[PDB]
Amino acid sequence: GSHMKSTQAGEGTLSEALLHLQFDADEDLGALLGNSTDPGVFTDLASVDNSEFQQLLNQGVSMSHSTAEP
Amino acid sequence: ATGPTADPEKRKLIQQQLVLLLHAHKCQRREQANGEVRACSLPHCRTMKNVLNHMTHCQAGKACQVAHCASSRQIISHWKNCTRHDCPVCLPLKNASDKR
Ligand SMILES: [Zn+2]
Ligand SMILES: [Zn+2]
Ligand SMILES: [Zn+2]
């Protein structure tokens, strides 16, 4: 976010954002969630509740966004 | 006269949030093992790492009223139990993790 050419929508940006990052293979996040959870929070990824996260990620990297943070 | 029951933009947000969450947890974890770390490819890491710092002390599911705490915990609880070999949202991350 330090520098940018233009703030405009595009194609293949999110698939590149996926293919060029690192995931939970060499190390993982299972330790911060604790030994016990609440199944009332459990659902399918295609059924997630995230409309407030939509506004956080609209501040930069995506296929189409309203702005780009410094 | 009404909208559909499902939309692909929800799959794009959960994938853009999941790929950024899995990065932010590895970013948070590797910091204690390295003398220095480079600037991340995702700018939202700054805003999401503050949610992770709360979440190391939170596990109450839907009881927490914090916006990102419940949606992040919902992703991790799925990640810890899903048959990721055939789940359509887990599948692309499962494949992208291998750089060969
Ligand atoms: Zn980071
Ligand atoms: Zn919480
Ligand atoms: Zn799954």
mmCIF file of C-alpha atoms and ligand atoms in Angstrom:
data_model
loop_
_atom_site.group_PDB
_atom_site.id
_atom_site.type_symbol
_atom_site.label_atom_id
_atom_site.label_comp_id
_atom_site.label_asym_id
_atom_site.label_seq_id
_atom_site.Cartn_x
_atom_site.Cartn_y
_atom_site.Cartn_z
ATOM 1 C CA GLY A 1 0.000 0.000 0.000
ATOM 2 C CA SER A 2 3.073 2.360 -0.015
ATOM 3 C CA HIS A 3 2.787 3.007 -3.818
ATOM 4 C CA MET A 4 0.214 2.276 -6.609
ATOM 5 C CA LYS A 5 -0.167 3.081 -10.377
ATOM 6 C CA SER A 6 -4.017 3.395 -10.423
ATOM 7 C CA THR A 7 -7.070 2.346 -8.291
ATOM 8 C CA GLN A 8 -9.133 0.313 -10.836
ATOM 9 C CA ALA A 9 -10.828 -3.137 -11.181
ATOM 10 C CA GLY A 10 -9.283 -6.094 -13.136
ATOM 11 C CA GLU A 11 -9.104 -9.858 -13.911
ATOM 12 C CA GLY A 12 -6.756 -12.588 -12.546
ATOM 13 C CA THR A 13 -5.676 -10.404 -9.528
ATOM 14 C CA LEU A 14 -7.348 -12.614 -6.849
ATOM 15 C CA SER A 15 -6.121 -15.914 -8.430
ATOM 16 C CA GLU A 16 -2.570 -14.393 -8.392
ATOM 17 C CA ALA A 17 -3.157 -13.246 -4.737
ATOM 18 C CA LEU A 18 -3.870 -16.967 -4.027
ATOM 19 C CA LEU A 19 -1.055 -18.609 -6.057
ATOM 20 C CA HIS A 20 1.761 -16.270 -4.735
ATOM 21 C CA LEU A 21 0.986 -16.521 -0.925
ATOM 22 C CA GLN A 22 1.864 -19.107 1.820
ATOM 23 C CA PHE A 23 -0.680 -21.232 3.803
ATOM 24 C CA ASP A 24 -0.863 -23.469 6.956
ATOM 25 C CA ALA A 25 1.484 -26.286 5.692
ATOM 26 C CA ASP A 26 4.898 -25.715 7.455
ATOM 27 C CA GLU A 27 3.175 -24.271 10.612
ATOM 28 C CA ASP A 28 -0.546 -23.836 11.585
ATOM 29 C CA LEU A 29 -3.163 -21.788 13.527
ATOM 30 C CA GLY A 30 -4.836 -24.674 15.514
ATOM 31 C CA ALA A 31 -3.144 -23.486 18.777
ATOM 32 C CA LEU A 32 -4.747 -19.954 19.035
ATOM 33 C CA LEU A 33 -8.369 -21.275 18.780
ATOM 34 C CA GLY A 34 -7.952 -23.430 21.975
ATOM 35 C CA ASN A 35 -8.832 -27.095 22.763
ATOM 36 C CA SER A 36 -12.661 -26.424 22.889
ATOM 37 C CA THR A 37 -15.044 -24.635 20.428
ATOM 38 C CA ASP A 38 -18.817 -23.897 20.032
ATOM 39 C CA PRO A 39 -20.596 -25.908 17.200
ATOM 40 C CA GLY A 40 -23.252 -23.089 17.027
ATOM 41 C CA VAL A 41 -20.528 -21.103 15.102
ATOM 42 C CA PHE A 42 -19.927 -24.006 12.625
ATOM 43 C CA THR A 43 -21.346 -23.784 9.050
ATOM 44 C CA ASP A 44 -20.338 -24.214 5.362
ATOM 45 C CA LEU A 45 -17.827 -21.654 3.930
ATOM 46 C CA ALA A 46 -20.491 -20.834 1.254
ATOM 47 C CA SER A 47 -22.855 -19.903 4.221
ATOM 48 C CA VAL A 48 -20.376 -17.688 6.251
ATOM 49 C CA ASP A 49 -21.530 -14.444 7.974
ATOM 50 C CA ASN A 50 -18.937 -11.760 6.917
ATOM 51 C CA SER A 51 -20.696 -8.492 5.673
ATOM 52 C CA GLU A 52 -18.540 -6.334 8.056
ATOM 53 C CA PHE A 53 -15.285 -7.994 6.743
ATOM 54 C CA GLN A 54 -16.401 -7.039 3.187
ATOM 55 C CA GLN A 55 -15.851 -3.351 4.183
ATOM 56 C CA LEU A 56 -12.333 -4.043 5.663
ATOM 57 C CA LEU A 57 -11.070 -5.873 2.505
ATOM 58 C CA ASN A 58 -12.637 -3.184 0.184
ATOM 59 C CA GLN A 59 -9.698 -0.908 1.312
ATOM 60 C CA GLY A 60 -7.190 -2.653 -1.079
ATOM 61 C CA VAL A 61 -6.345 -6.007 -2.830
ATOM 62 C CA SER A 62 -9.358 -7.591 -4.657
ATOM 63 C CA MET A 63 -10.820 -7.877 -8.231
ATOM 64 C CA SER A 64 -12.808 -4.580 -7.703
ATOM 65 C CA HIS A 65 -12.484 -2.021 -4.826
ATOM 66 C CA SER A 66 -13.666 1.508 -3.841
ATOM 67 C CA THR A 67 -10.210 2.663 -2.517
ATOM 68 C CA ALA A 68 -6.542 1.712 -1.785
ATOM 69 C CA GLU A 69 -5.099 2.315 1.750
ATOM 70 C CA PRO A 70 -1.644 4.041 2.214
ATOM 71 C CA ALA B 1 -38.443 -9.153 -9.007
ATOM 72 C CA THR B 2 -36.130 -10.619 -6.237
ATOM 73 C CA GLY B 3 -32.417 -11.593 -5.882
ATOM 74 C CA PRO B 4 -30.928 -15.167 -6.043
ATOM 75 C CA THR B 5 -30.442 -17.546 -3.033
ATOM 76 C CA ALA B 6 -26.614 -17.572 -3.592
ATOM 77 C CA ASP B 7 -24.010 -15.340 -5.383
ATOM 78 C CA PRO B 8 -20.313 -15.944 -6.470
ATOM 79 C CA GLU B 9 -19.150 -12.655 -4.789
ATOM 80 C CA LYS B 10 -19.655 -14.407 -1.376
ATOM 81 C CA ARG B 11 -17.182 -17.096 -2.640
ATOM 82 C CA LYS B 12 -14.743 -14.304 -3.716
ATOM 83 C CA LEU B 13 -14.944 -12.547 -0.279
ATOM 84 C CA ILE B 14 -14.527 -15.804 1.754
ATOM 85 C CA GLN B 15 -11.577 -16.792 -0.510
ATOM 86 C CA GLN B 16 -10.026 -13.255 -0.223
ATOM 87 C CA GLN B 17 -10.616 -13.366 3.608
ATOM 88 C CA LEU B 18 -9.375 -17.015 4.035
ATOM 89 C CA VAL B 19 -6.181 -16.424 1.967
ATOM 90 C CA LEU B 20 -5.535 -13.244 4.058
ATOM 91 C CA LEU B 21 -6.361 -14.956 7.434
ATOM 92 C CA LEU B 22 -4.044 -17.938 6.712
ATOM 93 C CA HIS B 23 -1.330 -15.388 5.730
ATOM 94 C CA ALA B 24 -1.944 -13.236 8.893
ATOM 95 C CA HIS B 25 -1.695 -16.309 11.240
ATOM 96 C CA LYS B 26 1.626 -17.419 9.586
ATOM 97 C CA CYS B 27 2.831 -13.733 9.672
ATOM 98 C CA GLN B 28 1.930 -13.543 13.424
ATOM 99 C CA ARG B 29 3.632 -16.961 14.123
ATOM 100 C CA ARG B 30 6.921 -16.572 12.073
ATOM 101 C CA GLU B 31 7.773 -13.176 13.699
ATOM 102 C CA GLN B 32 9.049 -14.913 16.915
ATOM 103 C CA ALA B 33 11.370 -17.225 14.836
ATOM 104 C CA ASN B 34 12.972 -14.559 12.510
ATOM 105 C CA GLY B 35 15.252 -11.522 13.223
ATOM 106 C CA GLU B 36 13.393 -9.471 10.523
ATOM 107 C CA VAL B 37 10.402 -9.964 8.105
ATOM 108 C CA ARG B 38 9.594 -8.171 4.765
ATOM 109 C CA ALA B 39 6.480 -6.040 4.015
ATOM 110 C CA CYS B 40 3.404 -8.241 3.227
ATOM 111 C CA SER B 41 1.787 -8.574 -0.261
ATOM 112 C CA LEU B 42 -1.696 -7.936 1.329
ATOM 113 C CA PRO B 43 -2.316 -4.437 2.955
ATOM 114 C CA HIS B 44 -5.265 -5.627 5.186
ATOM 115 C CA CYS B 45 -2.747 -7.684 7.306
ATOM 116 C CA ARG B 46 -2.372 -4.617 9.667
ATOM 117 C CA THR B 47 -6.168 -4.493 10.372
ATOM 118 C CA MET B 48 -6.622 -8.312 10.593
ATOM 119 C CA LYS B 49 -3.559 -9.002 12.899
ATOM 120 C CA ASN B 50 -5.271 -6.807 15.572
ATOM 121 C CA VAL B 51 -8.320 -9.206 15.388
ATOM 122 C CA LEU B 52 -5.965 -12.230 15.726
ATOM 123 C CA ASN B 53 -4.420 -10.666 18.900
ATOM 124 C CA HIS B 54 -7.963 -10.611 20.448
ATOM 125 C CA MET B 55 -8.822 -14.112 19.074
ATOM 126 C CA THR B 56 -5.864 -15.876 20.892
ATOM 127 C CA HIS B 57 -7.988 -15.171 24.069
ATOM 128 C CA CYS B 58 -11.476 -15.855 22.492
ATOM 129 C CA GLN B 59 -13.238 -19.206 21.703
ATOM 130 C CA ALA B 60 -16.948 -18.558 22.643
ATOM 131 C CA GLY B 61 -18.337 -18.939 19.041
ATOM 132 C CA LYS B 62 -21.371 -16.658 18.314
ATOM 133 C CA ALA B 63 -21.320 -15.186 21.887
ATOM 134 C CA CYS B 64 -18.520 -12.686 20.961
ATOM 135 C CA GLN B 65 -20.003 -9.433 19.535
ATOM 136 C CA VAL B 66 -16.755 -8.502 17.635
ATOM 137 C CA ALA B 67 -17.394 -8.404 13.846
ATOM 138 C CA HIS B 68 -14.254 -10.276 12.611
ATOM 139 C CA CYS B 69 -13.811 -12.595 15.671
ATOM 140 C CA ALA B 70 -16.868 -14.782 14.844
ATOM 141 C CA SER B 71 -16.277 -14.902 10.999
ATOM 142 C CA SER B 72 -12.564 -15.822 11.539
ATOM 143 C CA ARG B 73 -13.416 -18.487 14.220
ATOM 144 C CA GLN B 74 -16.125 -19.842 11.846
ATOM 145 C CA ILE B 75 -13.420 -20.336 9.120
ATOM 146 C CA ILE B 76 -10.906 -21.988 11.549
ATOM 147 C CA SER B 77 -13.509 -24.374 13.092
ATOM 148 C CA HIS B 78 -14.347 -25.515 9.507
ATOM 149 C CA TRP B 79 -10.566 -25.746 8.624
ATOM 150 C CA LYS B 80 -9.922 -28.010 11.699
ATOM 151 C CA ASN B 81 -12.646 -30.604 10.715
ATOM 152 C CA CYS B 82 -13.484 -30.431 6.930
ATOM 153 C CA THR B 83 -12.822 -33.203 4.336
ATOM 154 C CA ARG B 84 -10.848 -30.565 2.284
ATOM 155 C CA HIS B 85 -10.114 -33.092 -0.565
ATOM 156 C CA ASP B 86 -13.593 -32.378 -2.096
ATOM 157 C CA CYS B 87 -14.919 -29.137 -0.417
ATOM 158 C CA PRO B 88 -15.237 -26.483 -3.261
ATOM 159 C CA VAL B 89 -13.930 -23.485 -1.176
ATOM 160 C CA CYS B 90 -11.092 -25.442 0.581
ATOM 161 C CA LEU B 91 -9.953 -27.171 -2.704
ATOM 162 C CA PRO B 92 -8.235 -24.140 -4.391
ATOM 163 C CA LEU B 93 -6.219 -23.335 -1.169
ATOM 164 C CA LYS B 94 -5.361 -27.083 -0.796
ATOM 165 C CA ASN B 95 -3.930 -27.040 -4.383
ATOM 166 C CA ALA B 96 -2.288 -23.535 -4.250
ATOM 167 C CA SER B 97 -0.285 -24.523 -1.092
ATOM 168 C CA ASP B 98 1.928 -26.801 -3.306
ATOM 169 C CA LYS B 99 4.428 -24.639 -5.333
ATOM 170 C CA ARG B 100 5.969 -27.588 -7.359
HETATM 171 ZN ZN ZN C 1 1.523 -10.137 7.062
HETATM 172 ZN ZN ZN C 2 -13.873 -12.556 20.504
HETATM 173 ZN ZN ZN C 3 -14.562 -27.201 3.578
#
